[PDB]
Amino acid sequence: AHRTLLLRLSDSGEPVTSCSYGQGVLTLPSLPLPQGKKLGDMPVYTVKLAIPAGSPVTRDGLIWTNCPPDFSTQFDREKFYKKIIKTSFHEDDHIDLDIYVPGTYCFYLSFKNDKDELETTRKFYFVVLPILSVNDKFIPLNSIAMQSVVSKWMGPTIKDWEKVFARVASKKYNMIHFTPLQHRGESNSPYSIYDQLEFDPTVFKSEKEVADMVERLRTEHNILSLTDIVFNHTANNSQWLLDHPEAGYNHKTSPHLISAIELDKKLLDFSEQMEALGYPVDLKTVDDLIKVMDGIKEHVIGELKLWEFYVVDVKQTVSELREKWGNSKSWSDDNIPSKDDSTNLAQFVRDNATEPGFGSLGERGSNKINIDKFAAILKKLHSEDYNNGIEELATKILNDINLPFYKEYDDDINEVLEQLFNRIKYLRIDDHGPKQGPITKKLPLSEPYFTRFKAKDGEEYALANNGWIWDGNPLVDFASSQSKAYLRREVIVWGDCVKLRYGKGPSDSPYLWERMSKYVEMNARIFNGFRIDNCHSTPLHVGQYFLDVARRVNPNLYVVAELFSGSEAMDCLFVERLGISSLIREAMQAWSEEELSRLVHRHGGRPIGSYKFVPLDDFPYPADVKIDEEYCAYNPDDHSVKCVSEIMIPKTLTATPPHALFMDCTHDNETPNQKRTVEDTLPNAALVAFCSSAIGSVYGYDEVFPQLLDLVQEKRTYSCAENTGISKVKTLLNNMREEIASEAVDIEDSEMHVHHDGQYITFHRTNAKNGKGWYLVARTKFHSSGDQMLPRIKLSQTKATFKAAFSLERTGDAPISDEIIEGIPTKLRELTGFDIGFDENTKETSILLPQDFPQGSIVIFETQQLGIDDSLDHFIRSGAIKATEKLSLESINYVLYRAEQEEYDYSEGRSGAYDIPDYGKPVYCGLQGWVSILRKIIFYNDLAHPLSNNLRNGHAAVDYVVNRLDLYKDKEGVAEVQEWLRSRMERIKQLPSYLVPSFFALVVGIMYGCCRLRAMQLMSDNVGKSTVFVQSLAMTSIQMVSAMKSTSILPDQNIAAMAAGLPHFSTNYMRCWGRDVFISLRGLLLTTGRYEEAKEHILAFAKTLKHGLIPNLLDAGRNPRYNARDAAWFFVQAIQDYVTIVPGGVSLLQEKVTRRFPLDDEYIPYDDPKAFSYSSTIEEIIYEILNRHAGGIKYREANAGPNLDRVMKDEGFNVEVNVDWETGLIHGGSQFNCGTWMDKMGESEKANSVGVPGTPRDGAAVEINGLLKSCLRFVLQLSKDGKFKYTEVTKPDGSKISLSSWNDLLQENFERCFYVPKNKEDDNKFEIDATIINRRGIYKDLYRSGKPYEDYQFRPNFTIAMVVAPELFTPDYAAGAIELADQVLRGPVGMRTLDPSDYNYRPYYNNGEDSDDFATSKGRNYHQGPEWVWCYGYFIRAYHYFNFLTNPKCQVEGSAKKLKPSSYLYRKLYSRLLKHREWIENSPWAGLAELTNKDGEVCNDSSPTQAWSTGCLLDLFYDLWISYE
């Protein structure tokens, strides 16, 4: 009822890897269908594709897959089906792919280019494994035990075969591999097949005779059958080779082999005359080889016209020139080099005067010159008359042309002969290959490179037989035009079989493809799968088509291949596209004990105690996600694929390595008797059988046959001697794996530890769920290497039990028979003497071996780790959602974040962050600190990481997670979260030390996700249904909003207070800053939905109003600092944002606040009874800011002096602000002030800057007035609705002005005073002093300041006014101005705080520089150059608004004709937030920096997470959401 997996896609449509399991393939789990359900009843699996929101592929995006949309629909490799991608900028799209039948499926995406073209991603393949049942008992793919049997050695009758079936069925194999059961060819080798369409007539007559015999295996022995399938060749005597000779490579189809044919028939026709002269027809003298090679040199090499295939017949060309000379002539063109350049002129002719096919081999004289054009060239270069020197000249050209062909000739023939001698030596001299035997119908001087016959069409053909190059790429067809291997004699050939010529499709061999198809589908009706020999040498598209055909016959086809391509990636590519289910691996390939342990390590499993995958902070957590509230919705009869925990984020489809079928010995490798000893037959097979994969063996391996059987020659029959050699042991091993097969399913379920010590090899096999295990001690016998004693085996917190022990002993040599194959006599002695001590205290089992443990012996212990039970798994993954129930967006801060300085605040300095030895501390004390480290550790299984080491050596990090919550046990839901953590951590500590890291990370990850989910549920829809990036931004609102003990926002209470940033702006007076609070209030609080927290922050500053201004340094409402000309207008701005957004937000206006300061502007009286003296509603609070600003404000800051600013000069504490009513805007400050957000005060005594503000922004600041217009526009429409009673405003003299008059004042004068026209002509209208300018088409940063050139500086500050009061801007001017900021002020993450073309531009900030530089010392650069992130928010918000109003290409007729942005504009916005997503992804603090140096360089003094940095990107998303969604 739940069989879905999640295949996440990247922004380029590539599948995301959840773990690094190595080079692999997207294989879905091997599981049986649900109870009593057949193919078609329901989707076998559902692949849920996750597409990232607004990514380039979502633009006109389609998903294309060759997955048939229904079970009724058949599968076509090349027929693809459309799935439309639902575009959203906030929400990802999901597209299910229901799969009904196993096989190979793939998918790509199509999208609209950035050139508005059609682009296509890569095809990405994923495989659905077959479902192998034997009757009604499902067989897991890793429990397959395959016996390979060669047919011609099982006797001549079906009944004579069922004796072998019963023999292997006793050893408890569950699958039999059949060497080809087809009519065999001339040499009787099982792989050279006479006819693909009928079986061996010696045994079978019809398909039903074999299909019933194979079915008899299924019913009598519970055994499945698969057969070899040969694609690369057929036998050299098929009666259809006569009827269809084009199916191979002949002189007609593959002309390049003509030169190779006349060399092969020049050796069968030379061996027969070799006896005549200087024969040495066979002999072992190297010195005589030369006399046979010197006969080669002359009789075959010289008599054959080899060079003629490469060279151009010069004499034939010249006689064909004089004769033709009186014809087409005059190469009327100066494309001619002189006769001086005899190298370049030659090549020039080679290009222009050549018939098609030059340089390429073909017919005897296939390289010839176009004579009409070679003559014309000569005439122009030399003379029109032939006699005038042409003969010498023409021949000299062609000669120089042949020099590379002659060099190519010599190069080839040397390899031809040098290969013949080295081969014929081995082949005949018996140096290591016995067979001196000389000329015959067989044993000639050269093996037959071709198969000669007379075809039913009459003509004689010469097809080629295939083989293999020595170290050549098996993907390169050496029988195709692109190879010279048949000519160069570089082919090791099989005269048994003849290479088949598949083309680019059936169009190139319509009989061969049609025949092989019926060949394949025939055996697919019978068997359960195929075994594909030399699958790497079979071409891809060939194997792809036929396996698709077989799968159409038998949808549960089990494909096996001994696949050895050039690499693992290529192996995976073949497995991907062909649908191979298992790769074959051989254990006999090992050269030494160490080599074997490595082989066994590869296919053994995962390491013990390995990390497990959980969704962490890289996933979206939709509030509307389904959940197993107690991990209890999986019925074992549903055979569902479980989610990791209670949050139902489906199982992730990740590349895992292709499954392996480990053979302890195949039918082509040498017997243990030959390569090692017969004693090794026991340990070898036991080690292999312990691997986490399917196993196999050739018949005779267990029966210990003495030597590998010759597939060609031998005719002897398998002995009927039952229960020989290993037979009793394979019965035990396979029976053991039949029981294990039931529970272990996925790659993380089966763990391992293999140890190599001399001739001993240790294998511990472990299920990671129940803790069941097997321990194998195997003493191998590669050689008789003396007595070696194994050290005491110790297993921590594990209990062991003796299962069985055996020794294999040779009892004399093997019998010599002529009619039957009998093995070597063996004694299978049962062993004893093993001591299993168990310390009831340390719970350490010790295992000692007895000295009677000879080489070739094994012992097996059944083991059990202590503390692990089948219920532990369900215990750790349950109860986490119920624990987070009573949490709050405030309390989640204490569980996930808390900088160490924020932690000290609650711990009186006692606690803090956990110091990880050889590493350091996590940046948060909460779970995020662990997750930021664990994510990369789980991905790479970094069991060697310092944190991994520390988690093994002690339970301190285990206890730290739980204990620290004592600091916050009283906050909402923390006590319940703490108990869940406590209850699980205690149960973890009762496990072996090596298992603690994985369960620690698993438990932390689970509780992290549930807390992250709870956050998304408590926040508003726009956040709860969005991408990871939006949610990661929103989590900063929890980082910043918490209650503290040293500070707060209210003087009488300690409540939740938004920090400016972590870690340095979090404690005491350093936490709350009015400018940072309200710039961030919209993003962190309103976009997320924390309205009740936005109100409390507004009211808390309402109490601190004085001078008609809002303080920046909020000292918890207890002596704040009032040098902030900016905060009061961001404060009233947020009030409008609050009222606009909060449902019923108008209620804020009548909220009454205790005004803990006097209505004038006296002095700090925090204890005076006049603190709580009077009340002010937000109504009058807003008006008081507006009114007193007009009426004028004059005051020196209260308590001025060093005790406030130890560097600010005496005149800087005097702050004055008034309105120039000729314009209506607001001026203030001085050259000794820092009233704006750019408030860096210099302090370098060495550089002489003590008291000098780095960026005093005096006079009319753009934002301050833009924010004022916004406020005016706000209160005007507000009074219209009867919610604001004020209209008058008193001037310093005594005049009154209506708010609408002040409003229309700014509307008329703002753009005049601030714009800088692009045309010199217009300067006379905008109060411009062209002497102090830098760039036209700009809005001034300031109006009539102190330094007038600071008026005309390109700074991002104007974007704030564009956002808050766009009515002041004419669209074209704003649009063109912000396009320059896009090209000038826009960095990758930060907004450059100053035009890089200015002289004051210094974009590197060191608050520690001591040198004499007036600009940079003590960090005055803060606001001139450095790239700030929160300004990027106001920028792109306006970049959005005005590119939507101006450029028509950024508009599209949204539904119901309302204006909505186009994908061209979305794509532009998307490209400017990538560098921010990258930042918050790869940041130890899960946030955005406050500052960046030039061009994205990390500023080591920048706060790593700041409020306005993230809150202003959230601002953008809310814009797009609240307007278009």
Tab-separated table of C-alpha atoms in Angstrom, residues 730-996:
chain	number	residue	atom	x	y	z
A	730	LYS	CA	27.228	-26.215	0.629
A	731	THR	CA	24.047	-27.788	1.996
A	732	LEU	CA	24.776	-26.082	5.326
A	733	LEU	CA	25.820	-22.745	3.806
A	734	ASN	CA	22.882	-22.426	1.399
A	735	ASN	CA	20.423	-23.521	4.094
A	736	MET	CA	21.911	-20.823	6.326
A	737	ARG	CA	21.378	-18.180	3.640
A	738	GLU	CA	17.819	-19.383	3.001
A	739	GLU	CA	16.952	-18.437	6.589
A	740	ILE	CA	18.853	-15.125	6.442
A	741	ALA	CA	17.139	-14.237	3.138
A	742	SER	CA	13.894	-13.253	4.871
A	743	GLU	CA	14.777	-10.046	6.758
A	744	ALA	CA	17.813	-8.287	5.230
A	745	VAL	CA	16.512	-6.151	2.335
A	746	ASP	CA	18.365	-2.888	1.700
A	747	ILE	CA	22.044	-2.009	1.352
A	748	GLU	CA	22.243	-0.605	4.902
A	749	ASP	CA	20.790	-3.796	6.412
A	750	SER	CA	23.830	-6.096	6.056
A	751	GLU	CA	27.132	-5.098	7.683
A	752	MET	CA	30.496	-6.830	7.761
A	753	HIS	CA	34.056	-6.975	9.033
A	754	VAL	CA	36.744	-8.962	7.199
A	755	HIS	CA	40.218	-9.495	8.664
A	756	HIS	CA	43.288	-10.994	6.983
A	757	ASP	CA	46.079	-12.605	9.021
A	758	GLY	CA	48.494	-14.767	7.056
A	759	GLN	CA	46.671	-17.818	5.744
A	760	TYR	CA	43.692	-17.027	7.991
A	761	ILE	CA	40.762	-14.905	6.836
A	762	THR	CA	38.044	-13.682	9.199
A	763	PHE	CA	34.494	-12.874	8.068
A	764	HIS	CA	31.907	-11.434	10.446
A	765	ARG	CA	28.466	-11.107	8.828
A	766	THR	CA	25.945	-8.893	10.593
A	767	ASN	CA	22.370	-7.765	10.090
A	768	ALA	CA	22.153	-4.154	11.255
A	769	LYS	CA	18.488	-4.483	12.310
A	770	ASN	CA	18.220	-7.586	14.533
A	771	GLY	CA	21.908	-7.980	15.417
A	772	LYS	CA	22.012	-11.606	14.256
A	773	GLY	CA	25.384	-12.617	12.899
A	774	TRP	CA	27.704	-15.314	11.623
A	775	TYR	CA	31.444	-15.420	12.315
A	776	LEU	CA	33.628	-17.389	9.896
A	777	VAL	CA	37.231	-18.352	10.590
A	778	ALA	CA	38.661	-19.817	7.377
A	779	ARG	CA	42.242	-21.071	7.129
A	780	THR	CA	43.051	-21.030	3.415
A	781	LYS	CA	45.475	-23.359	1.609
A	782	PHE	CA	46.938	-21.524	-1.369
A	783	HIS	CA	50.160	-23.435	-0.644
A	784	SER	CA	51.463	-25.660	2.138
A	785	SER	CA	52.986	-22.786	4.099
A	786	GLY	CA	53.643	-24.187	7.571
A	787	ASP	CA	52.077	-23.860	10.994
A	788	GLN	CA	50.485	-20.527	11.927
A	789	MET	CA	48.453	-19.784	15.061
A	790	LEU	CA	45.658	-17.188	15.064
A	791	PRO	CA	45.400	-14.636	17.897
A	792	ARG	CA	42.514	-14.758	20.345
A	793	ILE	CA	39.329	-13.487	18.697
A	794	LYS	CA	37.518	-10.932	20.867
A	795	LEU	CA	33.987	-9.693	20.142
A	796	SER	CA	32.742	-6.774	22.224
A	797	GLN	CA	29.241	-6.919	23.728
A	798	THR	CA	28.494	-9.947	21.534
A	799	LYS	CA	27.483	-13.505	22.428
A	800	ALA	CA	28.680	-16.384	20.239
A	801	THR	CA	27.713	-20.012	19.654
A	802	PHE	CA	29.446	-22.855	17.821
A	803	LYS	CA	27.542	-23.752	14.648
A	804	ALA	CA	29.799	-26.181	12.736
A	805	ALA	CA	33.425	-26.843	11.846
A	806	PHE	CA	35.059	-28.847	9.068
A	807	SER	CA	38.453	-29.780	7.668
A	808	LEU	CA	39.118	-30.906	4.093
A	809	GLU	CA	41.786	-33.570	3.624
A	810	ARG	CA	43.148	-35.131	0.433
A	811	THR	CA	43.126	-38.952	0.414
A	812	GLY	CA	45.431	-39.667	-2.502
A	813	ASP	CA	45.283	-38.740	-6.156
A	814	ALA	CA	42.250	-38.807	-8.463
A	815	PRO	CA	41.039	-41.846	-10.428
A	816	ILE	CA	41.925	-42.080	-14.116
A	817	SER	CA	38.812	-42.844	-16.171
A	818	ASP	CA	37.819	-42.644	-19.834
A	819	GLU	CA	33.999	-42.682	-19.662
A	820	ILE	CA	33.279	-40.738	-16.450
A	821	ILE	CA	34.677	-37.721	-14.599
A	822	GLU	CA	35.441	-38.520	-10.961
A	823	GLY	CA	36.917	-36.132	-8.422
A	824	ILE	CA	39.694	-36.384	-5.864
A	825	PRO	CA	38.949	-38.491	-2.755
A	826	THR	CA	38.407	-36.235	0.254
A	827	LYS	CA	37.739	-36.728	3.961
A	828	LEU	CA	35.420	-34.065	5.411
A	829	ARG	CA	36.474	-34.239	9.053
A	830	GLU	CA	34.336	-32.507	11.667
A	831	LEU	CA	36.396	-30.354	14.012
A	832	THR	CA	36.188	-29.529	17.717
A	833	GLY	CA	38.270	-27.875	20.428
A	834	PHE	CA	36.964	-24.306	20.116
A	835	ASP	CA	36.814	-22.368	23.386
A	836	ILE	CA	34.085	-19.739	23.661
A	837	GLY	CA	34.689	-17.772	26.840
A	838	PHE	CA	32.143	-15.114	27.765
A	839	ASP	CA	32.848	-12.487	30.423
A	840	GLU	CA	29.498	-11.756	32.091
A	841	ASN	CA	30.910	-8.340	33.110
A	842	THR	CA	32.620	-6.789	30.075
A	843	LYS	CA	30.283	-8.930	27.907
A	844	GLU	CA	33.323	-9.810	25.777
A	845	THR	CA	33.185	-13.176	24.026
A	846	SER	CA	36.595	-14.745	23.413
A	847	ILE	CA	37.115	-17.386	20.724
A	848	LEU	CA	40.209	-19.605	20.720
A	849	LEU	CA	41.076	-22.039	17.989
A	850	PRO	CA	42.467	-25.539	18.557
A	851	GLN	CA	45.842	-26.467	17.110
A	852	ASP	CA	44.026	-29.182	15.143
A	853	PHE	CA	42.908	-26.654	12.532
A	854	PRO	CA	44.808	-27.496	9.344
A	855	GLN	CA	44.958	-25.378	6.225
A	856	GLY	CA	41.705	-25.876	4.369
A	857	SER	CA	39.448	-25.794	7.446
A	858	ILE	CA	36.572	-23.563	8.543
A	859	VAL	CA	34.557	-22.948	11.683
A	860	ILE	CA	31.289	-21.007	11.802
A	861	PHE	CA	29.845	-19.316	14.886
A	862	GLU	CA	26.325	-17.966	15.104
A	863	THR	CA	26.662	-14.660	16.939
A	864	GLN	CA	24.374	-12.015	18.419
A	865	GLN	CA	25.149	-8.423	19.356
A	866	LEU	CA	23.841	-7.476	22.785
A	867	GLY	CA	21.292	-4.699	23.151
A	868	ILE	CA	19.987	-5.049	19.584
A	869	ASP	CA	16.542	-6.571	19.072
A	870	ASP	CA	13.850	-6.326	16.425
A	871	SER	CA	11.960	-3.809	18.610
A	872	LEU	CA	14.933	-1.446	19.015
A	873	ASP	CA	14.526	-0.338	15.391
A	874	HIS	CA	10.889	0.698	15.862
A	875	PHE	CA	11.750	2.287	19.221
A	876	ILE	CA	14.302	4.730	17.803
A	877	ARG	CA	12.117	5.900	14.905
A	878	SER	CA	8.897	6.398	16.916
A	879	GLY	CA	7.601	8.950	19.409
A	880	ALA	CA	9.505	11.917	17.976
A	881	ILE	CA	6.477	13.724	16.515
A	882	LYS	CA	4.498	13.466	19.764
A	883	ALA	CA	7.504	14.872	21.659
A	884	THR	CA	7.642	18.005	19.488
A	885	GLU	CA	3.883	18.556	19.836
A	886	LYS	CA	3.907	21.293	22.489
A	887	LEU	CA	6.864	23.129	20.909
A	888	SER	CA	6.751	26.766	19.820
A	889	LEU	CA	8.671	28.786	17.246
A	890	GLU	CA	10.347	30.386	20.270
A	891	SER	CA	11.209	27.138	22.062
A	892	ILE	CA	12.551	25.473	18.893
A	893	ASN	CA	15.443	27.944	19.204
A	894	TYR	CA	16.605	26.255	22.419
A	895	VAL	CA	16.525	22.783	20.834
A	896	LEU	CA	18.240	23.501	17.494
A	897	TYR	CA	20.469	26.571	17.765
A	898	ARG	CA	21.786	28.644	20.723
A	899	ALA	CA	25.261	30.001	20.025
A	900	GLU	CA	27.754	29.171	22.763
A	901	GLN	CA	27.517	32.772	23.967
A	902	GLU	CA	23.719	32.453	23.976
A	903	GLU	CA	24.185	29.202	25.908
A	904	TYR	CA	26.496	30.777	28.501
A	905	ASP	CA	23.757	33.379	29.067
A	906	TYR	CA	21.579	30.592	30.512
A	907	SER	CA	24.406	28.608	32.142
A	908	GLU	CA	26.270	31.371	34.038
A	909	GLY	CA	29.265	30.382	31.914
A	910	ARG	CA	29.258	26.749	33.069
A	911	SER	CA	28.170	24.936	29.896
A	912	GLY	CA	28.472	26.000	26.262
A	913	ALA	CA	29.194	23.957	23.158
A	914	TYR	CA	30.593	20.429	23.173
A	915	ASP	CA	34.305	20.399	22.364
A	916	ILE	CA	34.961	17.523	19.947
A	917	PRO	CA	38.615	16.433	20.383
A	918	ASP	CA	40.784	16.682	17.258
A	919	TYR	CA	38.088	18.893	15.723
A	920	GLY	CA	36.499	21.718	17.701
A	921	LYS	CA	32.993	22.697	18.673
A	922	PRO	CA	29.720	22.705	16.733
A	923	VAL	CA	28.670	26.287	16.100
A	924	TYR	CA	25.303	25.795	17.818
A	925	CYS	CA	24.704	23.976	21.083
A	926	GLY	CA	21.437	22.652	19.642
A	927	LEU	CA	20.795	19.849	17.192
A	928	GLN	CA	21.739	22.001	14.183
A	929	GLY	CA	25.317	22.073	15.466
A	930	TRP	CA	25.370	18.284	15.214
A	931	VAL	CA	23.512	18.167	11.882
A	932	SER	CA	25.855	20.647	10.178
A	933	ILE	CA	28.706	18.219	10.914
A	934	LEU	CA	26.868	14.897	10.597
A	935	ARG	CA	25.436	15.503	7.106
A	936	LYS	CA	28.823	15.232	5.393
A	937	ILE	CA	29.777	12.379	7.748
A	938	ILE	CA	26.703	10.285	6.894
A	939	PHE	CA	27.193	10.972	3.182
A	940	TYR	CA	30.736	9.577	3.142
A	941	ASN	CA	30.341	7.087	6.031
A	942	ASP	CA	33.304	8.853	7.653
A	943	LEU	CA	33.633	6.417	10.547
A	944	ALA	CA	37.153	7.852	11.005
A	945	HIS	CA	35.890	11.375	11.721
A	946	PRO	CA	36.909	12.876	15.100
A	947	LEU	CA	33.220	12.981	16.068
A	948	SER	CA	32.874	9.332	15.035
A	949	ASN	CA	35.935	8.483	17.142
A	950	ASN	CA	34.642	10.478	20.125
A	951	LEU	CA	31.230	8.802	19.936
A	952	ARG	CA	32.942	5.399	20.198
A	953	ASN	CA	35.271	6.251	23.087
A	954	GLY	CA	32.627	7.603	25.466
A	955	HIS	CA	29.007	8.541	26.045
A	956	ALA	CA	29.722	12.224	26.727
A	957	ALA	CA	28.381	13.635	23.462
A	958	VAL	CA	25.465	11.244	23.995
A	959	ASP	CA	24.809	12.785	27.418
A	960	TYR	CA	25.509	16.355	26.269
A	961	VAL	CA	22.553	16.302	23.842
A	962	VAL	CA	20.183	15.504	26.715
A	963	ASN	CA	21.642	17.413	29.663
A	964	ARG	CA	21.925	20.872	28.071
A	965	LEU	CA	18.109	21.027	27.835
A	966	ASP	CA	18.038	21.356	31.641
A	967	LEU	CA	18.777	25.018	30.907
A	968	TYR	CA	15.516	25.162	28.929
A	969	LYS	CA	13.487	22.364	30.570
A	970	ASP	CA	10.853	24.929	31.571
A	971	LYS	CA	10.192	26.284	28.076
A	972	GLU	CA	7.272	25.076	25.985
A	973	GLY	CA	7.694	21.499	24.760
A	974	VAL	CA	11.399	21.243	25.604
A	975	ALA	CA	10.735	18.968	28.594
A	976	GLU	CA	8.902	16.529	26.316
A	977	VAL	CA	11.542	16.750	23.576
A	978	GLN	CA	14.198	16.258	26.259
A	979	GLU	CA	12.500	13.115	27.583
A	980	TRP	CA	12.317	11.567	24.107
A	981	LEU	CA	15.996	12.364	23.547
A	982	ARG	CA	16.773	11.099	27.054
A	983	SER	CA	14.757	7.897	26.630
A	984	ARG	CA	16.403	7.053	23.292
A	985	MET	CA	19.944	8.110	24.258
A	986	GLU	CA	19.852	5.903	27.369
A	987	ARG	CA	18.810	2.929	25.227
A	988	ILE	CA	21.639	3.747	22.805
A	989	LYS	CA	24.285	3.681	25.549
A	990	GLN	CA	23.355	0.035	26.234
A	991	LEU	CA	24.818	-0.872	22.805
A	992	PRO	CA	28.375	-1.841	21.801
A	993	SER	CA	30.634	1.191	21.466
A	994	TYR	CA	31.101	0.812	17.703
A	995	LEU	CA	27.331	1.141	17.109
A	996	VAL	CA	26.852	4.378	19.082
